[PDB]
């Protein structure tokens, strides 16, 4: 039961992708459960966007 | 306008007000945020002294 999600956010807003957090990205846009099982990956794409 | 130096810092007292930090979502963008002894998701139901 594998799945993948994709989106684009700002630079200093990547610390809010984690269980138990507060902010404008974890309150109105995207939220994660408490008992998560998976991995999170990010990289810089300044040259293509 | 201006801030102090490290070797001689500043201290200010706050009292008799209501704390609604959602007003900072528009402009401020913080790169660091850590809290000790409390949980970020429980900060809207308490009273501080």
From Swiss-Prot, chain A:
Effect of residue 15 to S: In strain: Omicron/BA.2, Omicron/BA.2.12.1, Omicron/BA.2.75, Omicron/BA.4, Omicron/BA.5, Omicron/BQ.1.1, Omicron/XBB.1.5, Omicron/EG.5.1
Phenotypic consequence of residue 47 to K: In strain: Omicron/BA.1, Omicron/BA.2, Omicron/BA.2.12.1, Omicron/BA.2.75, Omicron/BA.4, Omicron/BA.5, Omicron/BQ.1.1, Omicron/XBB.1.5, Omicron/EG.5.1
Top-level taxon in the UniProt lineage: Viruses
Region (Integrin-binding motif): 10-12
Function statement: Attaches the virion to the cell membrane by interacting with host receptor, initiating the infection. The major receptor is host ACE2. When S2/S2' has been cleaved, binding to the receptor triggers direct fusion at the cell membrane. When S2/S2' has not been cleaved, binding to the receptor results in internalization of the virus by endocytosis using host TFRC and GRM2 and leading to fusion of the virion membrane with the host endosomal membrane. Alternatively, may use NRP1/NRP2 and integrin as entry receptors.
Assembly, per entry: Binds to host ACE2. RBD also interacts with the N-linked glycan on 'Asn-90' of ACE2. Cleavage of S generates a polybasic C-terminal sequence on S1 that binds to host Neuropilin-1 (NRP1) and Neuropilin-2 (NRP2) receptors. Interacts with host integrin alpha-5/beta-1 (ITGA5:ITGB1) and with ACE2 in complex with integrin alpha-5/beta-1 (ITGA5:ITGB1). May interact via cytoplasmic c-terminus with M protein. May interact (via N-terminus) with host bilirubin and biliverdin, thereby preventing antibody binding to the SARS-CoV-2 spike NTD via an allosteric mechanism.
Protein name stated in the entry: Spike protein S1
């Amino acid at each position: 039961n594998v799945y993948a999600d994709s989106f684009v956010i700002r630079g200093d807003e990547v610390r809010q992708i984690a269980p138990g957090q507060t902010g404008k990205i974890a309150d109105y846009n995207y939220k994660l459960p408490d008992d998560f099982t998976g991995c999170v990956i990010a990289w810089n794409s300044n040259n293509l966007d | 306008t201006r801030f102090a130096s490290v070797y001689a810092w500043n201290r200010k007292r706050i009292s008799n007000c209501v704390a609604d930090y959602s007003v900072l979502y528009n402009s401020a963008s913080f790169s660091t945020f850590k809290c000790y002894g409390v949980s970020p998701t429980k900060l809207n139901d308490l009273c501080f002294t």
